[PDB]
Write a sequence for this structure.
């Protein structure tokens, strides 16, 4: 296939797994879940469902920071995810647990002016790869984020660090003030 | 800010390419990256060069850290490129997946082109016909310099 | 007006009202009143005056966030305006009322580096187009009220533009003091 | 970082301007907008193009959402250009408030230069004499093409 | 020297003290002291030492904002210093005091992966002086920051605004979440 | 985003279009003038340290000259305009060169090829620094040779 008659076309694919060591990578696996690998040793795991793993409304951020049993990179990514919400204005929707260094965060969801809009909009950015933009409404009720080890977690898409390097600019550019002094 | 990372021509080996042999590009292709704020191959070229520097010139910690790329994300790439491709994703337009690429190659001398990232849509890879105008005008612009 | 024999200079002016459905439009009625309109149905009226509508230092901001009976765009604009005030430390100056989804945020301006400098600087940045003194900005008007309103033609002193808001967006959470060790 | 937005020559309608006919700019000026980083009209044109196709490609929201623009303010316009313009305003240098623009139109052939903005000071647009020297280089660069 | 016949390799050195009015200027002396001069009136001495100055974990920083006995530029620059600390979680690890208008901060620091590495990273970014980016520790047990006079103490390095201007951009890029609704 | 500061013009030893630096700017030197050819490159090249330092010095000059002096000095203006004058990620790249134990620029000493007869000059570029000490000229002479090769291209 000589397009200009003397130039032949050739495709190319980039194997992003070589970036495992330094950057964190992202796969989709199934449509419901979306997975993140922070190296080959630990990695976050984002799910949507109708069940609920956290049954209490308290989260205990400050206690978890005081104990410091968690892993720094994972908590950094959860921070980038949560601060990247457009209009988080419902602390009750958030809930989490940090028992013994674990990460276990959860978001409740539920005309369209709710936190479901914001969390879903940042979720689409978190793991990447034809209705309107506003009020994408997933049928599932609760979003869960957890920590997991590394296995095969790339079925729909190959690893892609696009999303994580993408929303770093969006990490704090849409936030409502919660106190007169931030 | 704008991307400032240098490219220490540059060849991509078997590791960063899936199912391919060692590949090389001419000096003009890498030189074109330094003065263009829209390309996608330049971004991954800088990411892979930087990554190689990260392994060879920085020992692995016992607990590896993500802070290193946080403070130096826009030095390698235009994050607005990611935002713009997100806009093409949202607006039903074909967007860039950053995964599959395409590049023209000359038969006799192997005078290649800077690859332009493939535009995907509808969760599927486009037909050749849809961007046939784009590859045709790229070929015209490439034969222009001769 | 011919130049170099063959070039004739022709002016052209852009009308930014077409951007009303995509981004806010900031404009001026006069040096006191200013209107940042969102859509054909909402807007924020900024107004300097010696009169006070807020006479209590109890914002109840988080309660209003919990209630959520306000337009989200107005609260987003308010948060962007408050976050970008350079060197804001006196918390008693701000005083907000959000009774039943209302928006009424008053900053008490009440000597060169005081809070009124940052408030008036970001104010003038909000409503652009309305020497050499970037600091020591003085204004006789004593209080700065920010009240929601419906759409009304009040862009008399200047045409509507988005440039103030878009330029201000880059400065969010860049010119603020810390308030907690862990933040 | 730097802007990466692509435009849809380029023609400007009657409603979208003030008491103005359908003005069309050739491909060379719009291509000039790609690499330039301080052109007022290029940035405003990118904003207007985004608004134009965003109104019709996406169904209008029942509730207006500024979330769309905030997510991609930087990809369309160099905010640092606004900072430069504000610095000229506060230093009482002449400065452009993005409203009134001027361009050198060829009388016979009809080709037009890229619009440069009308620097305004003292709450009144400057006379043509007050910056005529800047107009002279705009003519001289047009001489280069011929 | 001379290259290609008619091209002489000249040299150029920049006196950076002229910019003292417009933005802060950095410094270095010893391997510990790193002065930074906000202008021609005062600066901040940023000294590593073993001997602390504050023996309590209290600040009352909001009271410092309330009384307003300090100078705005000093609080601004130390705020830029603290916000840019990568992954700050242990708030006990820094004490401070602002009574009487004087600023006096004390970052306590004491296998690697703790607050010490982040404080030292932002410290070396404040004023420029293997594979030591992550596991960066100093023998010194405390980092004092205090306002100081204009007696020039910079011998190792000439003044330069590069560190502060560089760290201004990376302000809130690496902050953890501490509240459900920021 | 990107730098947008327009450098001022010194109409002294060279015609308008060029730029110059006084004895205040430089340690152990007199007034040094760079022509329009060098300063024109600064408006397109995003990877030049000396262009950023020129923009910093020019803004400092205009601020300390035309704006009214502050009764109590403040650093608000630079806090607003720091990314507008200069590209912060150039400082990030220099920091990366430092962290990688590679030669890096600390913006103090620069080099520039000057023509013996016609007195023309290329755009200055930074003297890289390794191991806390300046490099020898032979260490990075490849860059000097390549710059001579590019300098002959114009003439
Ligand atoms: C965006 O980039 C993504 C990453 O490259 C693209 O994903 C690739 O999409 C192609 C089709 O366009 C897939 O080919 C199919 O893959 C599915 C899923 O199974 C695959 O993955 C498992 C696990 O590694 C592997 O064992 C299988 O062999 C497949 O590779 C198969 O069911 C199909 O039969 C077919 O092989 C690629 O597999 C998929 N990448 C992977 C490996 O995840 C994505 O398509 C791009 N955007 C678009 C246009 O959708
Ligand atoms: C801190 O920043 C200050 C700016 O905010 C610097 O102030 C500037 O200092 C320079 C150098 O003194 C002034 O430039 C001129 O100074 C000469 C007098 O001394 C110089 O010239 C004579 C020969 O004429 C020479 O022998 C001396 O060695 C000096 O080079 C005056 O006659 C000129 O009119 C002019 O003032 C700047 O004008 C001055 N700017 C002002 C007023 O702020 C200060 O030097 C910097 N240094 C520190 C750390 O304080
Ligand atoms: C940029 O600055 C120029 C110069 O100040 C602004 O031009 C001025 O714009 C205002 C608002 O449109 C004009 O006021 C109008 O006057 C007409 C006629 O009396 C009246 O019918 C309107 O209701 C309004 O009062 C003013 O005349 C006009 N002056 C000039 C010299 O053109 C321009 O609007 C500014 N643009 C922005 C967005 O900053
Ligand atoms: C960039 O890095 C170079 C190399 O480190 C720095 O060169 C050094 O500059 C300082 C300036 O104070 C010199 O210090 C001086 O030393 C003499 C020795 O007698 C002393 O009399 C002076 O009072 C002063 O202390 C230093 O010797 C010189 N060399 C080295 C290897 O450090 C340069 O200053 C750095 N520039 C910047 C601004 O980063
Ligand atoms: C690049 O090199 C040229 C020389 O090839 C430099 O021009 C020179 O400028 C200096 C300024 O002091 C001249 O020095 C003085 O010349 C007068 C006589 O004109 C003499 O009486 C003084 O004792 C002193 O020697 C130098 O002669 C002159 N050379 C010429 C004729 O070009 C130019 O400044 C250099 N530019 C840079 C920045 O590298
Ligand atoms: C979330 O925090 C609340 C509040 O208690 C705080 O956090 C605790 C971990 C501990 O440090 C307390 O001193 C703090 O004040 C927790 O609610 C308490 O839970 C404990 C058992 O965990 C129970 O004894 C108390 O009665 C609860 N209620 C109180 C103090 O009002 C909650 O359990 C924390 N959640 C998690 C997952 O840790
Ligand atoms: C920091 O404050 C603590 C706590 O006191 C609170 O803050 C004070 C500024 C004041 O507003 C108090 O009423 C607040 O309760 C001080 O520690 C002790 O505070 C108690 C009252 O809670 C007081 O009776 C003690 O004397 C204080 N202890 C000492 C040793 O003074 C602390 O002193 C304050 N530190 C500084 C540096 O100001
Ligand atoms: C993670 O990425 C690293 C990048 O270095 C890979 O390491 C290389 O792996 C190949 C294939 O086994 C070896 O031939 C190279 O010598 C390795 N290079 C190194 C360590 O510098 C590694 O394979 C990747 N691992 C996974 C699970 O994807
Ligand atoms: C998530 O939010 C939904 C909102 O519907 C909560 O559903 C409520 O559950 C309580 C349980 O006591 C019922 O009494 C209410 O009638 C339900 N509806 C509403 C509107 O409150 C649900 O409990 C929340 N789940 C979590 C885990 O927070
Ligand atoms: C472009 O095509 C040329 C061949 O025209 C490739 O260069 C190599 O040429 C030799 C001799 O003809 C062949 O034996 C090699 O097999 C060719 N390499 C390849 C990849 O086939 C050149 O590598 C091609 N470049 C690209 C990346 O398209
Ligand atoms: C907001 O902008 C929209 C979009 O341009 C405007 O809607 C147009 O209004 C004109 C009025 O003559 C109609 O002819 C067009 O058909 C409308 N649609 C479009 C897509 O242009 C609207 O008028 C503007 N509103 C305000 C208050 O300025
Ligand atoms: C705005 O702030 C000023 C200055 O603090 C307040 O004026 C003081 O008000 C108190 C009571 O709150 C009086 O006892 C003082 O005498 C007033 N001082 C001065 C200098 O006027 C003013 O009350 C505040 N206004 C509002 C509406 O909160
Ligand atoms: C500002 O926003 C408030 C929010 O309530 C508007 O209040 C309206 O008040 C009328 C009269 O009681 C009610 O019928 C409406 O339902 C309220 N609207 C809304 C959206 O809540 C108020 O009108 C707005 N404008 C001004 C100028 O205050
Ligand atoms: C700074 O932190 C270090 C490390 O935690 C503190 O050193 C410990 O102080 C406690 C105080 O109860 C002593 O019991 C321990 O013996 C100390 N540690 C060791 C290893 O000996 C130090 O006190 C802190 N300094 C402050 C807050 O000023
Ligand atoms: C830091 O600044 C404070 C506030 O200026 C200094 O504390 C005193 O401030 C008053 C203000 O005029 C001076 O009269 C005193 O001389 C200052 N302290 C004393 C007793 O000398 C504080 O000293 C400064 N700390 C420094 C510069 O080391
Ligand atoms: C796979 O995808 C389906 C989509 O419906 C989902 O129900 C399921 O939980 C996903 N995960 C696994 C492990 O099957
Ligand atoms: C990950 O890769 C590293 C590379 O050094 C290797 O040592 C380690 O065993 C691998 N597995 C895990 C779980 O870390
Ligand atoms: C995409 O293809 C699907 C069928 O696979 C079709 O229903 C849809 O309308 C097409 N358009 C989109 C969403 O891109
Ligand atoms: C696109 O069209 C080409 C040419 O007919 C065809 O080979 C290819 O399969 C098509 N791709 C899709 C995704 O329909
Ligand atoms: C400004 O206009 C307002 C109405 O928007 C009016 O009440 C006020 O008196 C005017 N102020 C002046 C002319 O100073
Ligand atoms: C509003 O502030 C008042 C001040 O007394 C406080 O008592 C009250 O609880 C607050 N109300 C709400 C609804 O948060
Ligand atoms: C730096 O070294 C000198 C000489 O040993 C010493 O006197 C000085 O105390 C050291 N640092 C400081 C500023 O204390
Ligand atoms: C650099 O030059 C100095 C002075 O001639 C010399 O002493 C030193 O050994 C040289 N180093 C190298 C390897 O260039």
């Amino acid at each position: 296939s000589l397009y200009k008659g003397v130039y032949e076309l050739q495709t190319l694919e980039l194997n992003m797994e070589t970036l495992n060591m330094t950057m964190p990578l992202s796969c989709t696996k199934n449509n419901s879940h979306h997975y993140i690998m922070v190296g080959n040793e630990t990695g976050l795991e984002l799910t949507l469902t109708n069940t609920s793993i956290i049954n209490h409304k308290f989260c205990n951020l400050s206690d978890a920071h005081k104990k410091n049993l968690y892993d720094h990179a994972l908590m950094s990514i959860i921070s980038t995810f949560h601060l990247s919400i457009p209009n988080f204005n419902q602390y009750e929707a958030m809930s989490c647990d940090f028992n013994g260094g674990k990460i276990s965060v959860q978001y409740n969801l539920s005309h369209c002016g709710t936190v479901a809009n914001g969390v879903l909009q940042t979720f689409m950015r978190m793991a990447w790869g034809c209705g309107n933009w506003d009020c994408i409404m997933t049928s599932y009720q609760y979003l869960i984020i957890q920590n997991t080890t590394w296995e095969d977690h790339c079925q729909f898409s190959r690893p892609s660090p696009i999303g994580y390097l993408g929303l770093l600019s969006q990490r704090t550019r849409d936030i409502y003030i919660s106190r007169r002094l931030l | 800010g704008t991307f400032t990372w240098t490219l220490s021509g540059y060849c991509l080996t078997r590791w960063m390419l899936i199912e391919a042999e060692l590949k090389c590009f001419g000096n003009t292709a890498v030189a074109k990256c330094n003065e263009k704020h829209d390309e996608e191959f330049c971004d991954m070229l800088r990411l892979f060069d930087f990554n190689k520097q990260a392994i060879q010139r920085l020992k692995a910690p016992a607990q590896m850290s993500i802070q290193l790329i946080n403070k130096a994300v826009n030095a390698l790439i235009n994050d607005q490129l990611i935002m713009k491709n997100h806009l093409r994703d949202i607006m039903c337009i074909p967007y860039c997946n950053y995964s599959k690429y395409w590049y023209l190659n000359h038969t006799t001398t192997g005078r290649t082109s800077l690859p332009k990232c493939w535009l995907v849509s509808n969760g599927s890879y486009l037909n050749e016909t849809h961007f046939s105008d784009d590859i045709e005008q790229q070929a015209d612009n490439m034969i222009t310099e001769m």
